[PDB]
């Protein structure tokens, strides 16, 4: 199987500068090289270039909607492209509002796909709920069908087609939800696992269920949108919104791990890493690394070890 | 439902200066304000004043028994008072020996109450076991009936009436128990969950059981005495006795959380926060915050999120 | 029952200087004294002296094989000696390659013994796999029968007799396995619990199983080889190879704890503590302490508490 890496150095999703430097550090950590050492065929598509929409007017509170509309449109296309050739897309953020792109494009080639959203936040606000224009906190809105038209068309997103329903998505790691978002997720009966659930059930059962719940009947393709703020701030401190009492580096790898074992990975998102937001170098480095290790996890590497088949090490 | 906050800035329970500054910081963190933002009616009773008993003689080893007898007597009264009006009492320590007060008063209005003691220590020593006069390490002795008279009457506590039996209390978080205490807890067949049990069962099951065990038959009122030393020292470092390998910030919120969901909260204790014992500002701040968040937890706030009913955020 | 402590201040197993200072600090922390306070009879055999083999030639890549062959031979003997008298041997490292000794000697008196290897690493490389001469990363090779002769006889180890099979050993804590090692452990169908398994099952079940798996039929004696690098680097930072996302101080004590409860402890290994590798004093101190506490755990001390029988503390 093949693997194509895509950098989406973008940041117009939220107000903190750095996230675009994201994929830069991830590579500078040897993400590619390592990925190669695995049983997967890897290719680097380099980092997209995002033309800046002059005079981007703040559609209501929602900010820079046009810049975020073309960047996401351009991406989705690139994704659908590789998705076509049969390769697995590994998007590198860049803030999380690049999910709109990454997922839509993916959907094209596989509209039967299910999404697993490991994030501290739900990002399911619509332009009608947000308390900030930060689109990086709305992606699920532009993708959910049950929320189509539920808000004024947004400048630059016209190109998006709600590709998934509240029954094909699952949240893992939620711990800082806005009133509005809570309403919508309860109303649209979405399946999640907030820290309290993980706390209760145990990352073990969480996956166990999230799987049968999404792959009980027909086994579909999986799109893993991993928000690095989703692990606890001790483990991935360099982010836009640290939020305490989150997923642990272990549970983080327990998830990427069970997903790899299902053999249904098709698209991955390593978003929100902000190489500029580290209180000390080490912190940025911790972040980047646990981020990298999460990826390679998705593609093989088991904490128990890996031995290349057929060869007799004895 | 209503909520009345009471500060018990006291410290004669143990030898370290600061605990009295406790409720000061908790408020200075916005404990009140936040509490208001919830669905509960909150009122601040201000902080009690504790007249100092001149020439407080150390009844045997037990120290400052008289100062600790009037402070606790005065408190219990104030508690029973609000307990009468039907409001939920939220005592802010101040060391943990203020439990004698807080609980006794509460008992008055509801003598059917059950107590959940989240603490690293059991504090069940009698004046006959302690290796220190530190009363903050004996509270359960003055409240347990099965231990009534089992020790020489103490100067200043004469006013206390053993209000609960070893079958209405449950410990969660024990990890540093004195020989004597261990004897007594085993002898009086008390129900606990030491770190090893939590370790084994999982905070999930722990509550699950502690509940049925205390509310299997008749559903009574709950008194949550939370000792901030009870979470691990990483999470609530600013305390009298850090003790490693304790409850985690998550499990800490998983507990306050399931208790809120039972709808049986009647009295709460946020004890031992010592704003002076932080190796660095941050530490004191971590402490205070996780302390505050534990409270608001008890009163509503879920890590999944909260949306005010009736309103359509869409 | 009796307890004899043995120091194996050795370091030729790996390239980092300090590990030999190991048992020195462990004692200097009061390991002995504390052990005495327990219900066990303790005796200090002092620290062995390890004659240095002049001109130790690096058998292929494998380094200092002769120094490591006599130190391990001398040890095994001392162990078998006390094992004979019926006492429980508590070896203090010194690097982990002293397992070859400690276990072999033990095997002598009880060849039916089972081994529980709490380590981050498997150390099951043969002189034919290692990428370093570091013998401290091969011990299981010289002890496994299914690996006997599978590699060129090594200078100084000729005296060792493969004493256990891949069905009497169990790994707990694995998280940094070399290709070769992974091959061998899979091939020889060994029973392990990598961090991912612990992650999934929960230290609770892990033991539960490892026990029945090793003591389902016939209850044998247990040899606990505990590698301090096995807990996460936050908790036991002063080591040769920190490796993130490992066993926690709690799970660490949950293990030593359930092993004590089986009453089948016969030999213990507190290896790899390097009092020189601490980024700050505190770190070395954390290490040593959690190391000490792990031991006393093995011999009684429960986090719930301990009361000397027959005595009425009331
Ligand atoms: N960092 C994130 N998401 O990844 N924050 C989301 C917060 C909020 N819901 C918003 O739209 O601003
Ligand atoms: N910090 C506490 N309790 O909250 N310590 C209790 C220790 C001991 N049992 C005593 O009475 O001194
Ligand atoms: N610290 C350890 N083991 O305890 N490292 C083992 C690493 C490697 N397998 C080796 O032989 O070098
Ligand atoms: Mn997000
Ligand atoms: Mn987020
Ligand atoms: Mn206490
Ligand atoms: Mn305590
Ligand atoms: Mn080892
Ligand atoms: Mn190791």
């Amino acid at each position: 199987k093949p693997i194509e890496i895509i950098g989406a150095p973008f940041s117009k999703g939220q107000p903190r500068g750095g996230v675009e430097k994201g994929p830069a550090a991830l590579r500078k950590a040897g993400l590619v090289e390592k990925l190669k050492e695995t049983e997967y065929n890897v290719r680097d598509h380099g980092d997209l270039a995002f033309v800046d929409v002059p005079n981007d007017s703040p559609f209501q509170i929602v900010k820079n909607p046009r810049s975020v509309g073309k960047a996401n449109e351009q991406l989705a296309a690139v994704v659908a492209e590789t998705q076509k050739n049969g390769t697995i897309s590994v998007v590198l953020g860049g803030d999380h509002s690049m999910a709109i792109g990454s997922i839509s494009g993916h959907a094209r080639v596989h509209p039967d796909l299910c999404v697993i959203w490991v994030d501290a936040h739900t990002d399911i606000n619509t332009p009608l709920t947000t308390s900030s224009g930060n689109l990086h906190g709305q992606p699920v809105a532009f993708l959910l069908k049950e929320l189509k038209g539920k808000f004024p068309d947004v400048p630059g997103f016209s190109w998006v087609t709600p590709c998934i329903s509240a029954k094909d998505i699952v949240y893992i790691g939620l711990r800082d939800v806005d009133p509005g978002e809570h309403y919508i997720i309860k109303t649209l009966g979405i399946k999640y696992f907030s820290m309290t659930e993980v706390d209760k059930l145990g990352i073990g059962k969480v996956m166990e269920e999230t799987f049968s719940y999404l792959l009980g009947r027909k086994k579909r393709p999986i799109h893993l949108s991993f928000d690095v703020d989703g692990l606890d701030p001790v483990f991935t401190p360099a982010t836009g919104t640290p939020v305490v009492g989150g997923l642990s580096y272990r549970e983080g790898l327990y998830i990427t791990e069970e997903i790899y074992k299902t053999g249904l990975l098709s698209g991955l998102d390593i978003m929100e890493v902000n190489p500029t937001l580290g209180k000390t170098p080490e912190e940025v480095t911790r972040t980047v690394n646990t981020a990298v290790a999460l990826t390679l996890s998705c593609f093989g590497t088991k904490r128990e070890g890996n031995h290349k088949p057929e060869t007799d090490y004895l």
Side-chain angles (χ1 to χ4, degrees), chain A residues 248-303:
Chain A
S248 71
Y249 178 86
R250 271 167 51 176
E251 306 176 298
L253 303 204
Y254 183 79
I255 294 171
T256 48
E257 249 168 37
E258 286 298 287
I259 270 177
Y260 156 88
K261 272 173 59 223
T262 74
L264 303 178
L265 190 65
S266 185
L268 216 210
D269 292 312
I270 304 303
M271 328 291 299
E272 289 293 5
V273 165
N274 198 325
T276 69
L277 303 174
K279 263 181 278 294
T280 89
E282 136 67 33
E283 299 205 343
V284 176
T285 286
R286 190 179 315 163
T287 298
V288 179
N289 291 306
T290 117
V292 155
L294 274 181
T295 301
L296 302 178
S297 191
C298 293
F299 300 138
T301 324
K302 295 181 174 58
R303 280 174 286 173

Side-chain angles (χ1 to χ4, degrees), chain A residues 171-193:
Chain A
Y171 282 115
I172 297 174
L174 301 172
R175 81 187 90 101
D176 176 33
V177 152
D178 291 309
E181 278 177 283
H182 183 278
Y183 179 77
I184 313 177
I185 53 176
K186 287 305 304 176
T187 287
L188 288 55
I190 297 176
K191 186 59 167 167
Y192 55 46
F193 286 83

Side-chain angles (χ1 to χ4, degrees), chain A residues 7-14 16 18-23 48 50-52 56 64-72 92-98 135 157 271-273:
Chain A
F10 192 57
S11 60
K12 287 70 174 59
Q14 42 68 59
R16 287 172 185 290
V19 267
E20 67 285 328
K21 287 177 155 69
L48 305 191
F50 298 110
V51 296
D52 221 304
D56 200 340
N64 309 311
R66 304 186 190 62
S67 301
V68 183
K70 180 53 193 176
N72 270 296
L92 310 195
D95 72 57
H96 206 175
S97 54
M98 289 313 298
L135 278 154
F157 302 83
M271 328 291 299
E272 289 293 5
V273 165

Side-chain angles (χ1 to χ4, degrees), chain A residues 24-268:
Chain A
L26 288 168
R27 285 219 190 69
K28 192 63 156 58
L31 173 52
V32 191
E33 295 83 77
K34 299 189 177 301
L35 269 173
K36 288 181 181 172
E37 285 178 43
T38 82
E39 56 164 55
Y40 276 73
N41 228 303
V42 205
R43 187 207 170 189
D44 208 323
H45 179 293
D47 294 334
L48 305 191
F50 298 110
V51 296
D52 221 304
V53 173
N55 180 60
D56 200 340
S57 299
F59 173 61
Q60 308 194 60
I61 288 184
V62 183
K63 309 190 198 75
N64 309 311
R66 304 186 190 62
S67 301
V68 183
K70 180 53 193 176
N72 270 296
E73 169 167 55
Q74 171 177 178
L75 182 56
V78 189
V79 170
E81 195 52 58
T82 56
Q83 281 297 329
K84 180 180 232 179
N85 304 300
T87 77
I88 303 181
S89 52
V90 200
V91 187
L92 310 195
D95 72 57
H96 206 175
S97 54
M98 289 313 298
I100 299 192
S102 172
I103 303 181
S104 286
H106 188 177
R108 292 166 180 170
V109 184
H110 299 86
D112 51 321
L113 64 63
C114 60
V115 161
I116 307 180
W117 200 271
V118 208
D119 191 318
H121 324 85
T122 32
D123 313 326
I124 194 171
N125 286 305
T126 64
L128 304 179
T129 66
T130 24
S131 292
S132 68
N134 317 330
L135 278 154
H136 84 159
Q138 299 181 51
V140 177
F142 293 51
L143 312 188
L144 258 187
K145 296 183 178 178
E146 297 88 326
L147 226 61
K148 170 170 171 48
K150 297 293 187 181
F151 51 103
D153 299 304
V154 184
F157 302 83
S158 47
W159 62 270
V160 188
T161 306
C163 34
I164 64 296
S165 58
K167 236 69 178 180
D168 311 303
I169 177 181
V170 181
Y171 282 115
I172 297 174
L174 301 172
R175 81 187 90 101
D176 176 33
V177 152
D178 291 309
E181 278 177 283
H182 183 278
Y183 179 77
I184 313 177
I185 53 176
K186 287 305 304 176
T187 287
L188 288 55
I190 297 176
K191 186 59 167 167
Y192 55 46
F193 286 83
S194 79
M195 288 312 303
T196 113
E197 274 75 70
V198 188
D199 268 337
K200 163 187 169 61
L201 324 183
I203 201 51
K205 181 65 181 170
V206 181
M207 295 313 270
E208 204 161 277
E209 286 179 38
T210 42
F211 283 144
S212 81
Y213 166 92
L214 291 171
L215 321 182
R217 313 166 222 179
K218 307 292 192 296
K219 283 53 180 176
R220 46 250 200 76
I222 303 177
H223 182 76
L224 179 53
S225 200
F226 205 120
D227 184 341
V228 151
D229 73 47
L231 298 208
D232 184 289
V234 150
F235 307 116
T236 45
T239 326
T241 344
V243 172
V244 293
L247 298 154
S248 71
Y249 178 86
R250 271 167 51 176
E251 306 176 298
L253 303 204
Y254 183 79
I255 294 171
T256 48
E257 249 168 37
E258 286 298 287
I259 270 177
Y260 156 88
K261 272 173 59 223
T262 74
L264 303 178
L265 190 65
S266 185
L268 216 210

